[PDB]
Design a protein around this ligand. Structure first.
Ligand SMILES: C#Cc1cccc(Cn2cc(CC(=O)O)c3ccccc32)c1
Ligand SMILES: [Ca+2]
Ligand SMILES: [Ca+2]
Lengths: 420, 441
């Protein structure tokens, strides 16, 4: 829907399909208490005040993460809850939105607005300020099957997106050897980008989020987390390289043509339509419900079910029964290990710590000694033998045994809860 | 590349045009007729054999125009300026033969079966050289499309309250007897669980999947997969909203696996299942899930199939297939996939000296990857080793008795593997090297 919903007389959930702050102000004029939720409340530009800044109330600005950590809706705090950027498919956004949908009516809200500039099926649209030119096979620098001519990046400031750190390092090196002032950027860095202007080409992943560029060169692919039901013995959380989607393409292209005209150069003309996410995100939600939010798996199900019963939101395979059953069987986790995996910012702190629990309780070693398995560096009492492998969270370098009862439990959940 | 809601005028020099229009608006009939009327010769390409034959028959009856009809099974030549062909038959004919057509309409250009992708890629690569003035990429559902409401169809979410356990939800008995009803499941099997557990009921209901053809009453409830094509009166449709699709897994055990996966349905699927009601008589649509994948992506396994058919049916060197597929991928406004052209070209280029007779058989069998099947069977026979299983797939080896000594030299996984295997065959190692060479991160 193109325009802001009128407040209904009984509770309803509406959609606001915006174009690319004013809408909350309106409801607040009508005397309504408004909660706005975003992934983050830092300024969109990356520069500016926080959205939560006072004197700029009947309008509260928070995040899905804080909302979840606060425990959801309070029993009568708001009339209207705005779930902004409701296309976001990170775990926190999905669980937080699911929670709003499940709780808002009971907490006495009259309206939930699911707002986004990018609803399901959206595609990138032409930008008036940005000329788009396909890469050809001609040029000195090989780039994902096409080529970059040295001329279009010699002099000026340019941004090149690659899908991985390695390709970034690799590409930067070839440019440096041809005289280009090339800086590689990825997570684990900052500052190395020459701000003074002066010629540069930044070769980056999507870690970058401030200065401005004459052109953007896009590989048009991105790395994503996926779950594989691989039966070796159970499932695997891994990464796939996929074609980018419309938000990614729009976001990357958007680093140029701010003010002055810009150029966007691409490897592929197309994108994935926005609007699906992977079952591994569901797994993340249950993990986070158990590790962070003191949510029983069934309480997590209720919130996620509310999500999936709601039309116009990103879609995913219905694996709630499966994942709820998996985490239900993961009992007697070692509390110390969980603290440690939480503390270190592991992706699946509950799963990592639970695998650790099973290792230590059977005095067996981790699937590896990658720093994921850090909490177990009691390496010598442990070292003895095959790993009781529950599931694959990374590459395995130890000998394994597939016979632990938890392993059989998960396999049984797989055969029973996953559709044929 | 130009975007159109109506038939683009024939330009003076070559042009690729996109036609996004309701498919009742005679994309396949009114549009080529209007071009013919202007003096052009027009080729109309469709994925379906039945559709191609059906446009010919509609033009004859409704307009007394007898088009040329070209399909695998059946070829008719009247000399009409209108030709209807399947993409597959178009490819068998060598693609664009010089000077034959002024206008080529790639109808249902959203289609992602192999014949459409290789066929459209071939048109985009060859048309201008062959003297065509215009290529029209025609679909009702371009990339990114979502289902829109149907004026004649009321849509009602299924609740969990009901006598009928249906994909985590419930069908209340009251909404399906009497009247005429169609129910979509995703596999053969649960077309039964639903069917059987349905005359503890009252029925007239029966389950169609692949092997049946027509048992349908024209008071009923039909429970079927997608194989029932778009017949006979329904007051309602009820949709499990999931589908089975083919995918490739780079499983490194030793190489890759062709397998299937259950996914949320996409929009072309939803619209189409829903479409079998509200055909004049207003209909009700009941769904398990309010959501759908937007249309416009396909799996790398379809690329594999293109190269496979290129070698098996169309005598295309893998490098030739690549050129056609590259033209598809370089063209804006089409379904996208992972860029695995180098990898699959590489794979098939290494597969030499296939047993011609094994290939003949897998082709006549209608197996899915006749080339890959016949090739695995080729290396089995030459190593005197048995097939990966004794599935119907491997029946060209059905004079087994000498070729059983030990392990299967496994090149790739096309199904379940029941025999013991070895992983050291040079062709296996070759594929493994191509994986390192051409697949990312
Ligand atoms: C790409 C591709 C591909 C995939 C499967 C089967 C086929 C074979 N195939 C299909 C058709 C379509 C048809 O039967 O008309 C065809 C026509 C002539 C020769 C071969 C034909 C091609
Ligand atoms: Ca798999
Ligand atoms: Ca796998």
């Amino acid at each position: 829907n193109s325009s802001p919903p009128a407040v209904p007389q009984s509770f309803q959930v509406a959609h606001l399909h915006a174009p690319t702050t004013k809408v909350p102000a309106a409801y607040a004029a009508q005397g309504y208490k408004v909660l706005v939720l975003n992934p983050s409340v830092a300024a969109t530009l990356g520069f500016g005040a926080y959205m939560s800044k006072a004197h700029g109330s009947p309008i509260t600005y928070s995040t899905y993460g804080k909302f979840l950590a606060d425990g959801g809706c309070s029993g009568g705090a708001y009339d209207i809850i705005i779930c902004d950027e409701c296309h976001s498919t990170d775990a926190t956004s999905i669980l937080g939105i699911g929670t709003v949908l499940d709780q808002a009516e009971t907490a006495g809200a009259r309206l939930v607005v699911l707002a986004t500039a990018t609803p399901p099926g959206s595609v990138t649209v032409s930008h008036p300020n940005i000329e788009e030119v396909a890469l050809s096979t001609t040029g000195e620098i090989p780039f994902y099957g096409k080529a970059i001519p040295l001329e279009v990046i010699k002099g000026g400031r340019h941004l090149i997106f690659c899908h991985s750190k390695k390709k970034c390092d690799e590409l930067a090196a070839k440019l440096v050897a041809l005289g280009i002032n090339a800086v590689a950027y990825y997570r684990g860095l900052d500052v190395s980008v020459i701000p003074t202007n002066g010629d540069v080409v930044v070769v980056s992943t999507d870690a970058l989020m401030t200065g401005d560029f004459d052109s953007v060169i896009d590989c048009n692919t991105c790395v994503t987390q996926t779950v594989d039901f691989s039966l070796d013995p159970t499932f695997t959380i891994e990464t796939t390289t996929l074609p980018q989607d419309a938000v990614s393409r729009t976001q990357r292209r958007g680093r140029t043509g701010r003010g002055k005209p810009g150029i966007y150069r691409f490897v592929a003309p197309g994108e994935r339509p926005s609007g699906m996410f992977d079952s591994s995100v569901l797994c993340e939600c249950y993990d986070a419900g158990c590790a962070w939010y003191e949510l029983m798996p069934a309480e997590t199900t209720v919130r996620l079910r509310a999500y999936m019963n709601t039309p116009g939101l990103p879609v995913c395979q219905d694996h709630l029964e499966f994942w709820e059953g998996v985490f239900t069987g993961l009992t007697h986790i070692d509390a110390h290990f969980l603290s440690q995996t939480k503390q270190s910012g592991e992706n699946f702190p509950y799963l990592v710590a639970y695998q650790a629990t099973v290792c230590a309780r059977a005095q067996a070693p981790p699937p590896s000694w990658d720093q994921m398995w850090k909490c177990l560096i009691r390496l010598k009492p442990t070292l003895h033998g095959p790993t009781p492998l529950l599931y694959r969270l990374g590459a395995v370098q130890n000998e394994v045994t597939l016979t632990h009862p938890i392993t059989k439990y998960i396999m049984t959940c797989m055969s029973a809860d996953l559709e044929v």
